[PDB]
Amino acid sequence: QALKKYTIDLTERAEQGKLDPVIGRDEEIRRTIQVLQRRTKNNPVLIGEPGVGKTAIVEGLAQRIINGEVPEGLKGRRVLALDMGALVAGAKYRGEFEERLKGVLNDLAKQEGNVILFIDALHTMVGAGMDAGNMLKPALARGELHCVGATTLDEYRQYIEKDAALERRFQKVFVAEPSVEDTIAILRGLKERYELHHHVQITDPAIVAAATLSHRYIADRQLPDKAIDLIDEAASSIRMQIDSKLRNKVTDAEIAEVLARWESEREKLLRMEQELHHRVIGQNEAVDAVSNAIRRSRAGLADPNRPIGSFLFLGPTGVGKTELCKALANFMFDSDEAMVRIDMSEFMEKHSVSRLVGAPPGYVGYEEGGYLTEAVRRRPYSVILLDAVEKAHPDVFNILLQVLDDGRLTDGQGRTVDFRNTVVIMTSNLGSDLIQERFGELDYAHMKELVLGVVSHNFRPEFINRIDEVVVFHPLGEQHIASIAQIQLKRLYKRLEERGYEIHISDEALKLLSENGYDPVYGARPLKRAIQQQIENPLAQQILSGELVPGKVIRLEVNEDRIVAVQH
Amino acid sequence: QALKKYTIDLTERAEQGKLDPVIGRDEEIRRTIQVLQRRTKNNPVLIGEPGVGKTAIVEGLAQRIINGEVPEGLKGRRVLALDMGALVAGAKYRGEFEERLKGVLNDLAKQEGNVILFIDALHTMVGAGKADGAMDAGNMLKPALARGELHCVGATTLDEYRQYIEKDAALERRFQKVFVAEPSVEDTIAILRGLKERYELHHHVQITDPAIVAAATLSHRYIADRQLPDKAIDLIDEAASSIRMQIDSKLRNKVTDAEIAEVLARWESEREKLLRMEQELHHRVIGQNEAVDAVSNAIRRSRAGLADPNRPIGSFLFLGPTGVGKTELCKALANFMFDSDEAMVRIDMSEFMEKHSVSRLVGAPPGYVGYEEGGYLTEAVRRRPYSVILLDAVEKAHPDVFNILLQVLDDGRLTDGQGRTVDFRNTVVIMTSNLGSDLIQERFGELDYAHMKELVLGVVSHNFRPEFINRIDEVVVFHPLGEQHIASIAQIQLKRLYKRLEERGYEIHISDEALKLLSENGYDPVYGARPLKRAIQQQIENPLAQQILSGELVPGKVIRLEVNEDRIVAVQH
Amino acid sequence: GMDAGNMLKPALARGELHCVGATTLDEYRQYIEKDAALERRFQKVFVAEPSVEDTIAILRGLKERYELHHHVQITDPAIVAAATLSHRYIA
Ligand SMILES: Nc1ncnc2c1ncn2[C@@H]1O[C@H](COP(=O)(O)OP(=O)(O)OP(O)(O)=S)[C@@H](O)[C@H]1O
Ligand SMILES: Nc1ncnc2c1ncn2[C@@H]1O[C@H](COP(=O)(O)OP(=O)(O)OP(O)(O)=S)[C@@H](O)[C@H]1O
Ligand SMILES: Nc1ncnc2c1ncn2[C@@H]1O[C@H](COP(=O)(O)OP(=O)(O)O)[C@@H](O)[C@H]1O
Ligand SMILES: [Mg+2]
């Protein structure tokens, strides 16, 4: 026949017990049996994003036909999995696909309506050459064929809803993606098959950790595909750890290994203030506020519909604004430059706002994405830095209203960007003169009140109502910026060790470097670039001059007005 | 058995020693054994490259099966390969190849989990059997995948996987991407040390280990079509057959690195490089002797080996007006270092003043004007990793370039918006500017070169970043030439004119007085050498081509370019 | 005309056949480099287009061959002119 060539008998495979114990999905099998028992249009199409187990639903339907959990219109049926990829194989000659397809339809008609057909990837029927829709389509309309289709939602609305006739011949049985507990029940149903295949043991905290962590930390796949992937890959890794040269129980540590590759952080976050003062000295209040935000987010108490950090940095520039934020992105998730910096001096127009959100449909910057939205859609776990937010056009803060209240922002191309795993940081200088001229012997709370009054005279009442906490950034004294210069000398010594040199200094040279470009009105960054220029010009010039040798004592001795490098 | 008819056994050929021993690739075989010992997504497909040992991993897996180094689950498994044209031997009837293949698949199902089948060129098996009223191979094996009756192992390229296996659904969810990286230089050394004894016992010659490491390094440096380690194996075996011919035709057996150089150039460095550099500069880039010394110092400090090899050699910002030898210097560096005239990339920064600067030049995330075209810089260096990079007219740049340029000036390697790494450590990055060129045209006369360079570096510190110009090797001052250098460059242009006329069949020698009339009538201090070019064109070629077509100047005579009162006339004698 | 390659292409991965191939670079890049079932049975002997002077030598030998057919006297300026002008003007 032609059914033997192109179809796979799923009820014969269920009779041989080769299918899976499909546990769950009972409403969708009831809905499919509601569609497969009509008089015309007996054709359910299963619809859901890939991985949600639609072939699993049809395998469960075949097992219920075998056992007898179906009504008296489905006992003794045969579920035959038709292969659309196997009929369009020899597509050379005229009328070579139509003879195959007509042979399958005549053999399904010979069985007197006793065969349910199953076409997975039903969108392959539309593009087959006219071809495959137009021959099935009269038999589908009159209920003479019981085609259980199965296709992805996006492929369905791209290929089948485009064609209103073939869309009429099918009924949508929406296969929704399962919850976390349902994945746990599936994996407890499928645990015995893996433990009798791999011949290992599986522990139930590893199962619930697989379901929870794949649900939480993977946005590509969907449950229960990714959870079964984690369990099977971990079981194979334990199988090769046994069978090479020693546990057999899969643990949640194995699940974390497979998730990270393919909870001492609590004790780290208890000393998160120490970690933030490892790299930025001074400014205890901002470190306390940011660490409070991190502790509230990681402890599970904060609002899950708001971003983690929503703060307004004030004060003069270069006092440790971006150094704190780079250290925060380093010790939060990954790295110093695993963050997003946006120079808000660029944005002073209306098309500036359309740049940082995205141009609407039909205009120039449409396909190019947004600016903020692309940077967060690429890095959903990152830190956002709005550098000098006072320079922005006064309607960027409406975009920021949506950002800081909801954690969502819809770009020009109509897709939502989730900000609920990031930290928004806005640096400004709206009260630099007022805090620099009144830093002396004034407290923190009244200074916050005064600069908050000034900022409230600057900003809109809706926007300052959204901010979580407004820190002050008091100016640093001479010893604070001197200690900053000491830390910069330490990281410069680290960079010289990376270059491969051991260079010492005198304390008089340290005082001259600390007093080259010291200015409280411009920050430590003029002092930083003064030290960096006055070291990287003469020392690296003497490197190119052929003087420095790796493995010699090099002291930064002082000149009358300069610093000389010696070779001892 | 139909297996004994037209299949190929790898375990038998590994047990009988007919297969090459495989050394290395333990991580890839380990991940392949991770993939094979699953219950879902059983079948691996080895995504690799044409010539990186995709067949070698399955050969080494068969050797570990025969040697018993495998885990207990894979012991006793007979790895077979599948041969197409062997199965299309005597099958011309109506469905005879399909019947033979169906019998092979029924015999593989009869083995019941015993045969781990290897299918090289898996996409080719998907698209093989263009038959007459019958089936192909891929859609007759495809029901045997999703019935648990096949333990396939595949091999393909990344592009053929992305086209022919990622597009399908069940073909995607039966297969795993065991990605096979291209091996390193020392990996190639280890592999060539593995198979040296077989080639020596075949070709009756001897192979030396410095020749092996030289073959590996020069194959990694020079050859771009093939890849490691197959190109190095081809070099070794081609040198072996060359030594065998030298025995046969007209008495050595030791393959040295000189033999490898003979084969490879047929397919002493630093000092001669310095001499050829400083000699071929004055052939092409005449004048600018301070610049010749500056470029010579830069090349000595680069190829001395005392600097950092994690940085690109080209790190330069240039100064001077149009037509001062900048492009001449770029093409001279290309013709010297890379053995080709057009061995460079010429892009001008005069038009990237907007936000489409990094996305046009460097690399575009999906949606830009430079996205459906490839890319201007990173994709061009993907085309030419052995080349020179030019950034002309840098005074019209954009601030989201300087960060990319600091990445080049610090580390060289560069990741564009698409997420691929393009390295610049074998390229020569060149930038040109013309801001301080007014003082150079103004007062180069009666002044020196060092104080001029210091004052124009002060002007750069007025205009540009003092920290961005630190990683630049040397910023040059291009000035001036009055009589003898004008005579030399006019002699160059006259040389190419003499080449065209001698291909026509004429012999023209310029007189000194006519060249003085060209130097007076063609040169001016305000412009440079372009009025010399158009004056050469007009005052020489237009009356000369007026005269040649006139039936006047007979071939084969010395044509002295004499002078008129103000013109330049050609004479016959 | 199964016709020839399914009785020859097996013998290439059988050692009984020692064939010598000749094809265009484009037909090689289409019909052989894709056909990876036979790729390590070949080596790309890239016959470069000859230069002008190699063509002049080829034309001197074939001058000696061609003058006995047309019964004329091909001249050596005609050889060097044909090489130079055919290299320039016929792309
Ligand atoms: N309710 C369920 N009971 C048992 N196994 C399930 C269930 N849902 C999913 N699975 C398993 O999850 C995996 C998903 O396979 P599929 O059914 O192909 O997934 P899908 O939802 O059909 O999406 P695609 O496009 O087919 S990958 C299989 O191994 C199924 O056995
Ligand atoms: N410094 C120089 N020394 C000697 N000859 C020079 C010098 N600068 C220019 N020339 C000559 O003048 C010509 C001017 O052409 P180019 O240098 O190519 O002009 P350009 O400014 O580089 O722009 P293009 O795109 O190359 S036309 C050169 O080809 C040389 O023949
Ligand atoms: N480590 C190795 N040990 C033995 N042989 C090797 C090794 N690496 C490469 N080879 C040889 O180089 C060839 C290249 O293999 P492969 O990349 O599979 O070619 P292709 O990609 O064209 O199928 C192999 O046939 C093998 O004989
Ligand atoms: Mg499916």
- Indicate left, alpha or beta for B46 from its phi (over 0: left) and psi (-120 to 50: alpha): beta
Non-local CB neighbours of B434 within 8 Å, separated by 6+ positions: B319, B320, B321, B322, B393, B395
Question: What is the 3-class SS of A289-304, one letter each residue?
Answer: HHHHHHHHHHCCCCCC
Q: Calculate how close chain A gets to B541, using CA atoms only, in Å.
A: 51
Alpha-carbon A521 to chain mean position: 40
d(CA A291, CA A276): 9
According to DSSP, residue A555 is labeled E
Sequence-distant (≥ 6) Cβ neighbours of residue B162 within 8 angstroms = none
Contact, A327 vs A468, CB < 8 A? no
Q: Which of residues 201-240 of B touch C (CB under 8 A)?
A: 225, 230, 234
Sign of the alpha-carbon torsion through B136, B142, B148, B150: positive
Could you tell me if A46 and A58 are in contact, meaning their C-beta atoms sit under 8 angstroms apart? Answer: yes
Q: Look-up: residue for tokens 């000398």?
A: A489
A417 CB neighbour count, 10 Å cutoff: 21
Label residue A568 exposed, middle or buried (CB < 10 Å: 0-12, 13-18, 19+). exposed
Contact (CB<8Å) B84/C37: yes
Q: Pairing between strand B7-9 and B153-157?
A: unpaired
Give dist(CA B212, CA B210) in Å, integer: 5
| Residue B363 main-chain phi, psi, to 5 deg | -175, 140
Q: What is the DSSP string of B502-522?
A: HHHT-EEEE-HHHHHHHHHHH
Q: CA B373 from chain center: how many Å?
A: 19
CB B2 within 8 A of CB B100: yes
Would you state the structure tokens that stand for residue A105, as one six-digit string? 């339809």
Do the Cβ atoms of B70 and B26 come closer than 8 Å?
no
Give the nearest ligand 1 atom to A56 CA: 17
In sequence order, the 6+-apart residues with CB closer than 8 A to the CB of B409 are: B311, B312, B315, B468, B471, B472
Structural biology method used: cryo-EM
Is residue A205 reached through a cis peptide bond, with omega within 30 degrees of 0 on the bond before it? no
List the structure tokens of A561: 């007005």
Q: Residue A148 corresponds to which tokens in the numbers above? A: 């259980």
* Chains contacting A (3+ CB pairs below 8 angstroms): B
Is the Cβ of A90 closer than 8 Å to some Cβ of chain B?
yes
- Looking at the DSSP assignment, which residues form a beta bridge with residue B120? B155
Q: Show the tokens assigned to C59.
A: 């034309």
Residue B105 CA from chain centroid, whole number? 45
B169, B171, B368 member nearest A368 (Cβ): B368
Q: Is A296 on the interface with B (CB under 8 A)?
A: no
- What's the per-residue H, E or C state across chain C? CCCCHHHHHHHHCCCCCCCCCCCCHHHHHHHCCCCCCCHHHCCCCCCCCCCHHHHHHHHHHHHHHHHHHHCCCCCHHHHHHHHHHHHHHCC
| Interface touch B91/C10, C-beta < 8 Å | no
State the Cα–Cα distance between residues A275 and B428, nearest whole angstrom: 42
B7 labeled part of a ligand binding site: no
| Residue pairs between chains A and B whose CB atoms are closer than 8 Å | 92
Ligand 1 atom closest to Cα of A189?
A: 4
């770029």: which residue's tokens? B330
Name the DSSP class of A178: P
Q: Is A322 annotated as a binding residue?
A: yes
Residues 6+ apart with CB under 8 A from A388: A317, A343, A344, A345, A427, A428, A429
Helix (H, G, I), strand (E, B) or coil at B125: helix
How would you class B243 by CB atoms within 10 Å of its CB: exposed for 0-12, middle for 13-18, buried for 19 or more?
buried
Measured between beta carbons, the chain A residues lying within 8 angstroms of B133 are 90, 93, 96, 99
How far is A309 from A312, CA to CA, in rounded Å?
A: 10
Question: Taking Cα atoms as reference points, which of A142, A144, A152, A147 lies closest to residue A132?
Answer: A147
Nearest to B131 by CA among C6, A325, A27, A549: C6
Q: Which amino acid is at B475?
A: V
Q: Is the distance from CB of B57 to CB of B22 less than 8 angstroms?
A: yes
Rg from Cα positions in chain B: 33
Find the angle CA(A180)-CA(A181)-CA(A184) to the nearest 5 degrees: 95
Largest CA distance in chain A: 107
Radius of gyration from C-alpha coordinates of chain C = 20
* Amino acid at residue number A309: G
Closest of B387, B470, B370, B371 to residue B423, by C-alpha: B387
Strand-strand pairing, B153-157 and B345-348: unpaired
Measured CA to CA in angstroms, residue C88 lies from A406, A408, C53, C77, C81 at distances of 70, 65, 14, 16, 10
Q: Is A201 exposed, middle or buried (0-12, 13-18, 19+ CB in 10 A)?
A: middle
Chain B positions touching C9 (Cβ under 8 A) are 85
Structural tokens at position B498: 């003499």
In terms of residues, how long is chain B? 573
For residue B513, give every residue at least 6 positions away whose Cβ sits within 8 Å of its Cβ, in sequence order, or none.
B562, B563
B99 in ligand 2 pocket by Cβ < 6 Å? no
Which residue in B166, B124, B163 sits closest to B141, CA to CA?
Answer: B124
Tokens of A404: 């800081």
Cβ proximity of B397 and B356 under 8 Å:
no
Cα–Cα dist A538/A418, whole Å: 49
Task: Report the distance separating Cα A552 and Cα A436, nearest Å.
Answer: 45
Residue listed under structure tokens 């892009």: B347
> 3-class SS at A254?
helix
Whether the CB of C43 is below 8 Å from some CB of chain B: the reply is yes
Chain B residues closer than 8 Å to A193 by CB:
39
Longest alpha-carbon distance in chain B: 104
Q: What separation in angstroms does the CA of B186 have from each of A207, B20, B29, B190, B516?
A: 43, 19, 19, 6, 62
How far, in Å, CA of B171 to CA of A448, rounded?
A: 63
According to DSSP H, which parts of B523-555 are helical?
A: 530-536, 542-548
Q: Quick one: tokens of A422?
A: 């990031």
Q: B472: closest CA among B433, B435, B415?
A: B433
Q: Ligand 2, residues B328, B348, B530: which to mutate, most atoms within 8 A of Cβ?
A: B328
**For every residue of B88-123, which 3-state class applies, written as one string?**
CCCCCCCCCHHHHHHHHHHHHHHHCCCEEEEEECHH
Q: What angle do CA A253, A255, A258 make, to 5 degrees?
A: 110
Per the CB < 8 A criterion, the answer to whether B241 and B266 are in contact is: no
Q: Which residues surround ligand 4, an ion (CB under 5 A)?
A: A 55, 120
- Residues near A210 by Cβ (< 8 Å), separated by ≥ 6? A187, A227, A230, A231, A234, A255
**Quick check: bond before B531 cis, omega within 30?**
no
φ, ψ dihedrals at B257, nearest 5°: -70, -20
Q: Do A229 and B41 touch (CB under 8 A)?
A: yes
Q: For residue C71, what are its two tokens?
A: 């019964």
Task: Find out whether B568 and B514 touch, Cβ atoms under 8 Å.
Answer: yes
Q: What is the C-alpha to C-alpha distance for residues A374 and A366, in angstroms, rounded to an integer?
A: 12
Q: Is there a contact between A411 and A373 (Cβ–Cβ < 8 Å)?
A: yes
Report residue B302 as tokens: 């680069």
